[PDB]
């Protein structure tokens, strides 16, 4: 815990990755209960990254 607001460890980063992973799975479950909602969830989701995000979808 010596480096606060400094060079952080990657074990910390890894733990963050699990946190990332865990939230992600929650969403997987969430969509699983209500898959129809994605699009509307997405419109808000697109509120960010959107031009690039259009690029991959348009690719698709």
């Amino acid at each position: 815990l010596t480096e606060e607001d400094g060079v952080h460890s990657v074990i910390e980063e890894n733990i963050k990755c699990i946190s990332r992973d865990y939230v992600l799975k929650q969403i997987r479950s969430l969509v699983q209960a209500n898959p129809e909602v994605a699009m509307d969830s997405i419109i808000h989701m697109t509120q960010h990254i959107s031009p690039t995000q259009r690029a991959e979808v348009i690719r698709i």
């Binding site: 419109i43 808000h44 697109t46 509120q47």
Partner: protein, 69 residues
């Protein structure tokens, strides 16, 4: 129409709640003409019901109930 009632219910009003709703209609105005604008119905209602959470112990509520109706 929510304007028009809210023009017609300037009274009977908790101004706090009014300031909330009138803000966020204002931000219906800000987010309109987006492809993705919806009314935050559940938010305003639930908030109001925070103030049901606070008022409801009292039966003081027949003007208020019928405005919240």
């Amino acid at each position: 129409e929510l304007q028009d009632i809210m023009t017609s219910v300037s009274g009977r009003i908790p101004p706090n709640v009014e300031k909330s709703i009138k803000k966020e209609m204002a931000q219906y105005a800000s987010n309109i003409t987006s492809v993705l604008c919806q009314f935050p119905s559940q938010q305003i209602a639930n908030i109001l019901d925070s103030h049901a959470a606070t008022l409801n112990r009292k039966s003081e509520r027949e003007v208020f109930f019928m405005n919240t109706q």
